[PDB]
Structure formats: C-alpha cells, structure tokens
Short mmCIF file of C-alpha atoms and ligand atoms in Angstrom, two decimals:
data_model
loop_
_atom_site.label_atom_id
_atom_site.label_comp_id
_atom_site.label_asym_id
_atom_site.label_seq_id
_atom_site.Cartn_x
_atom_site.Cartn_y
_atom_site.Cartn_z
CA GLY Z 5 6.95 -14.88 -13.12
CA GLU Z 6 4.31 -13.29 -15.42
CA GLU Z 7 3.16 -16.83 -15.46
CA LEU Z 8 1.76 -16.69 -11.90
CA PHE Z 9 -0.64 -13.85 -12.43
CA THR Z 10 -2.46 -15.26 -15.35
CA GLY Z 11 -5.37 -16.06 -13.18
CA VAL Z 12 -7.14 -15.64 -9.81
CA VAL Z 13 -4.69 -15.36 -6.84
CA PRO Z 14 -5.50 -15.09 -3.08
CA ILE Z 15 -3.69 -12.64 -0.93
CA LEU Z 16 -2.44 -12.55 2.66
CA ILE Z 17 -1.35 -9.25 4.35
CA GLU Z 18 0.25 -8.77 7.85
CA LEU Z 19 1.25 -5.32 9.25
CA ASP Z 20 2.76 -4.24 12.54
CA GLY Z 21 2.87 -0.66 13.67
CA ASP Z 22 4.07 1.61 16.44
CA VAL Z 23 2.94 5.27 16.35
CA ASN Z 24 4.13 7.32 19.31
CA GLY Z 25 4.06 4.32 21.69
CA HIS Z 26 0.64 3.01 20.40
CA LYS Z 27 1.07 -0.50 19.09
CA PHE Z 28 -1.39 -2.41 16.90
CA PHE Z 29 -1.83 -5.31 14.41
CA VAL Z 30 -3.71 -5.62 11.15
CA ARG Z 31 -4.54 -8.95 9.41
CA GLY Z 32 -5.51 -8.86 5.79
CA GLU Z 33 -7.06 -11.54 3.60
CA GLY Z 34 -8.67 -11.63 0.21
CA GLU Z 35 -8.14 -12.01 -3.57
CA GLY Z 36 -6.40 -10.28 -6.38
CA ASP Z 37 -6.40 -10.42 -10.24
CA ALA Z 38 -3.59 -8.72 -12.09
CA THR Z 39 -5.21 -9.41 -15.53
CA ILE Z 40 -7.62 -6.49 -15.00
CA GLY Z 41 -5.66 -4.82 -12.11
CA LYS Z 42 -8.16 -5.73 -9.52
CA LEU Z 43 -7.94 -6.79 -5.81
CA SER Z 44 -10.59 -7.22 -3.20
CA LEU Z 45 -9.37 -7.35 0.43
CA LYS Z 46 -10.64 -7.16 3.99
CA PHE Z 47 -8.58 -5.99 6.87
CA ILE Z 48 -9.15 -6.65 10.40
CA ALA Z 49 -7.46 -5.22 13.52
CA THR Z 50 -6.98 -7.58 16.48
CA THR Z 51 -5.93 -4.87 18.99
CA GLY Z 52 -9.34 -3.14 18.63
CA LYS Z 53 -9.14 0.54 18.40
CA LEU Z 54 -6.87 2.20 15.82
CA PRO Z 55 -4.61 5.09 16.98
CA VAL Z 56 -4.62 6.06 13.37
CA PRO Z 57 -7.27 6.50 10.50
CA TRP Z 58 -7.39 3.68 7.94
CA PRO Z 59 -6.77 5.90 4.90
CA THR Z 60 -3.35 6.69 6.01
CA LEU Z 61 -2.38 3.02 6.27
CA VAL Z 62 -3.86 2.18 2.73
CA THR Z 63 -0.61 3.01 0.80
CA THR Z 64 1.46 0.81 3.34
CA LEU Z 65 -0.65 -2.35 2.99
CA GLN Z 68 1.64 -3.66 -6.40
CA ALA Z 69 2.06 -6.99 -8.12
CA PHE Z 70 -1.52 -6.99 -9.13
CA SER Z 71 -1.36 -3.70 -11.05
CA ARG Z 72 -2.54 -4.06 -14.66
CA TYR Z 73 0.36 -3.39 -17.12
CA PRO Z 74 -0.52 -2.94 -20.73
CA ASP Z 75 0.51 -5.97 -22.87
CA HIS Z 76 3.07 -3.73 -24.67
CA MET Z 77 4.34 -2.34 -21.36
CA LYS Z 78 5.04 -5.79 -19.70
CA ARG Z 79 8.61 -4.94 -19.89
CA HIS Z 80 8.17 -2.26 -17.22
CA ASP Z 81 6.62 -4.79 -14.79
CA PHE Z 82 9.27 -5.38 -12.15
CA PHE Z 83 6.80 -6.81 -9.52
CA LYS Z 84 5.84 -9.84 -11.44
CA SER Z 85 9.45 -10.45 -12.61
CA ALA Z 86 10.59 -10.74 -8.93
CA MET Z 87 8.01 -13.57 -8.37
CA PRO Z 88 7.90 -16.10 -6.88
CA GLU Z 89 11.25 -15.25 -5.10
CA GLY Z 90 9.87 -11.86 -3.97
CA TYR Z 91 11.06 -8.31 -3.39
CA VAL Z 92 11.51 -5.96 -0.47
CA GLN Z 93 9.38 -2.85 -0.20
CA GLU Z 94 10.99 0.03 1.80
CA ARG Z 95 9.09 3.33 2.35
CA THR Z 96 9.35 6.52 4.33
CA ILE Z 97 6.01 8.47 4.21
CA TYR Z 98 6.22 12.14 4.93
CA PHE Z 99 2.92 13.52 6.08
CA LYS Z 100 2.77 17.36 5.55
CA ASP Z 101 3.03 19.27 8.81
CA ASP Z 102 2.98 16.21 10.98
CA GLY Z 103 4.65 12.94 11.80
CA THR Z 104 6.19 10.32 9.43
CA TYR Z 105 6.20 6.64 8.62
CA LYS Z 106 8.99 4.23 8.10
CA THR Z 107 8.13 0.83 6.40
CA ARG Z 108 9.86 -2.38 5.22
CA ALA Z 109 7.77 -5.01 3.62
CA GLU Z 110 8.22 -8.63 2.39
CA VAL Z 111 6.15 -9.47 -0.69
CA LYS Z 112 6.80 -13.08 -1.75
CA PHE Z 113 4.85 -16.35 -2.65
CA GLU Z 114 4.28 -18.80 0.11
CA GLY Z 115 2.60 -21.52 -1.77
CA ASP Z 116 -0.51 -20.60 -3.65
CA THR Z 117 -1.07 -17.29 -2.00
CA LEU Z 118 0.94 -14.07 -2.10
CA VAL Z 119 1.91 -12.95 1.48
CA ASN Z 120 2.90 -9.50 2.43
CA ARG Z 121 4.78 -9.08 5.71
CA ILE Z 122 5.03 -5.45 6.89
CA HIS Z 123 6.33 -3.49 9.83
CA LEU Z 124 5.57 0.07 10.43
CA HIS Z 125 6.92 2.89 12.64
CA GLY Z 126 5.12 6.20 13.42
CA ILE Z 127 6.91 9.10 15.08
CA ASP Z 128 6.65 12.70 15.88
CA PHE Z 129 2.85 12.81 15.24
CA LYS Z 130 0.94 15.57 16.85
CA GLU Z 131 -2.17 14.81 18.55
CA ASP Z 132 -4.52 17.72 17.79
CA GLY Z 133 -3.80 16.91 14.17
CA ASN Z 134 -5.66 15.30 11.31
CA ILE Z 135 -4.17 11.93 12.17
CA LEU Z 136 -4.19 11.49 15.96
CA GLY Z 137 -7.54 13.44 16.00
CA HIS Z 138 -8.95 11.03 13.29
CA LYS Z 139 -10.07 14.05 11.17
CA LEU Z 140 -9.58 12.40 7.70
CA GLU Z 141 -12.35 11.31 5.50
CA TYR Z 142 -13.00 7.52 5.10
CA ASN Z 143 -12.09 7.49 1.54
CA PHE Z 144 -9.15 7.44 -1.06
CA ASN Z 145 -8.55 9.69 -4.07
CA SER Z 146 -6.75 8.95 -7.43
CA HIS Z 147 -3.00 9.14 -7.56
CA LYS Z 148 -0.04 8.75 -9.86
CA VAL Z 149 2.76 6.43 -8.85
CA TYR Z 150 5.83 7.64 -10.77
CA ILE Z 151 8.31 4.80 -11.06
CA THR Z 152 12.05 5.04 -12.00
CA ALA Z 153 14.42 2.33 -12.59
CA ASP Z 154 17.04 1.12 -10.26
CA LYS Z 155 19.79 0.32 -12.77
CA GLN Z 156 22.19 -1.82 -10.69
CA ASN Z 157 19.27 -4.16 -9.84
CA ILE Z 160 13.04 0.16 -9.01
CA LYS Z 161 12.03 3.16 -6.81
CA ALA Z 162 8.95 5.24 -6.90
CA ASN Z 163 7.62 8.62 -5.94
CA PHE Z 164 4.08 9.82 -5.30
CA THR Z 165 1.88 12.08 -3.09
CA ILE Z 166 -1.33 11.09 -1.45
CA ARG Z 167 -4.31 13.49 -0.97
CA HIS Z 168 -6.20 12.55 2.06
CA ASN Z 169 -9.55 14.42 2.45
CA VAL Z 170 -10.10 16.26 5.77
CA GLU Z 171 -13.50 16.53 7.23
CA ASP Z 172 -13.29 20.38 7.39
CA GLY Z 173 -12.66 20.65 3.64
CA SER Z 174 -8.91 20.72 3.61
CA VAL Z 175 -6.49 18.14 2.14
CA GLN Z 176 -3.75 16.38 4.21
CA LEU Z 177 -0.89 15.58 1.82
CA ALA Z 178 1.71 12.82 2.27
CA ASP Z 179 4.90 12.53 0.23
CA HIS Z 180 5.96 8.82 -0.38
CA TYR Z 181 9.53 7.76 -1.11
CA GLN Z 182 9.70 4.03 -2.19
CA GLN Z 183 12.49 1.64 -2.97
CA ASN Z 184 12.31 -1.91 -4.18
CA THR Z 185 15.05 -4.57 -4.73
CA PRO Z 186 14.37 -8.17 -5.80
CA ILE Z 187 15.08 -10.92 -3.27
CA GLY Z 188 16.15 -13.65 -5.72
CA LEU Z 194 14.74 -3.11 -16.59
CA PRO Z 195 12.11 -0.43 -17.05
CA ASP Z 196 12.01 3.25 -18.22
CA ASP Z 197 10.38 5.96 -16.23
CA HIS Z 198 6.66 5.44 -16.20
CA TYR Z 199 3.75 5.62 -13.65
CA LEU Z 200 0.53 4.04 -12.40
CA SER Z 201 -2.85 5.36 -12.11
CA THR Z 202 -4.46 4.15 -8.93
CA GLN Z 203 -8.10 4.06 -7.79
CA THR Z 204 -9.25 2.73 -4.29
CA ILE Z 205 -12.58 2.50 -2.39
CA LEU Z 206 -12.81 2.21 1.40
CA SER Z 207 -15.85 0.48 2.94
CA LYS Z 208 -17.29 -1.34 5.79
CA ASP Z 209 -18.95 -4.72 5.89
CA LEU Z 210 -22.42 -5.82 6.92
CA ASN Z 211 -21.79 -7.85 9.98
CA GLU Z 212 -18.42 -6.89 11.46
CA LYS Z 213 -18.45 -5.35 14.89
CA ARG Z 214 -14.54 -5.22 14.76
CA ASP Z 215 -12.58 -2.20 13.53
CA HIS Z 216 -12.08 -3.05 9.95
CA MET Z 217 -11.77 -1.83 6.37
CA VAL Z 218 -13.15 -3.34 3.12
CA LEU Z 219 -10.95 -2.51 0.14
CA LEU Z 220 -11.35 -2.59 -3.51
CA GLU Z 221 -8.65 -1.11 -5.60
CA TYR Z 222 -7.92 -0.72 -9.38
CA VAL Z 223 -4.48 0.11 -10.64
CA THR Z 224 -3.28 0.39 -14.18
CA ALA Z 225 0.11 1.22 -15.68
CA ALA Z 226 0.74 3.97 -18.29
CU1 CU A 301 8.79 -1.99 15.89
#
C-alpha cells in the first residue's frame, strides 16, 4: 500500500457532470508524488464551453497527500491501494445549487485512475456559478477527517473568491469506504489554478500541495 507511493506516480482522471440539463466531460492527465504531497495535473474539456467555473470542480477532481512519517497511521487512502476506495460527496453551495458525487479511485496498472460522475441541480443562473462570477483561483482549506470505525469520512468548507469581492462558500460532506484506523485529524490544502501556453481548448492547469496535521 504505502509501498506504491514511494516514488513518482502518473495520474488519470475522468469526470462526468450534469448541471441543470447541461452535460460535459473532463479528461485529466498528469503526475503525482505523495512523498512531498505534490501533484501536477492538466485538465481538458472535450465538450468545449463549461456551464460551470473550474474552481467549483476542483474539490471534485487524496492518496497523494503528504502524511508525516509519524502520522502514517492516519493514512487511509494509501492503505486501500491498490484495491481502491469509493469517494462519495454532496457539495452544498451557500445560497445556490448543490453537487452529488461518487468516485472510483483505484490502480489500473502503473497509473492511478479516478472515475467520477457528478450531478448539479437547483442552480440559479444569475448566481456566482451559472454567471461565472468566481475568481480563477483557490484558497487554503482544512479537511477535517474522522474515522469510520466499522470500516473514513471528512468535513470541510471551500472559500471561492467572487469577482465583486465577496466569498462563495461551499460545505463539503465526504464519505470513503475501501473496495478491497485513524483518529480525528485534518489536512492543509494549497492549490494553484493556471492556463497553459498553447492550448486553445477550455482547460485548467493544476498544481496542488497537501500535507496532513
Ligand atoms: Cu448522470
């Protein structure tokens, strides 16, 4: 388990969404290194225009988070490998619509694949999301994780910067069960959103650093 993340690991991400009737598909490819809690990914939409800002999808696209070598006992994500785990989430955007997510994170050879499906409902156009009024960036957050004794689950809020100056919050409720146990801790997350030099498609370059505490 902890064996597989001792070096450089390539990543593959697939996501499928449906927000108020608007469908789309995002393909993600790159590389991650759990030793320093670093992953560099590039996401490409094949349906063209997104009906939803990239920052909101960031949390929906953790086995590469750096756990201190005395807190390896709290790393559930690496213990489930290479069998994998399921990642269920229901993101509650403040004063707007919500997300529903179930992901499949497992090893398919030499790469780690993340199969995701998303559902968006009750979103208001004229809001921060459908109007695309959120800043193309990501703040620092704390992912409080509790243990799921009879087999984990996490809780955290995301602060999306609005172009006007306000902040769009989003409560995240997470549940993880292994496909094939820690005390209450949390993770410190840092993420950078960017674009690439020669890429005329709607995309998102992602560099993220996460460390346990
Ligand atoms: Cu669907």
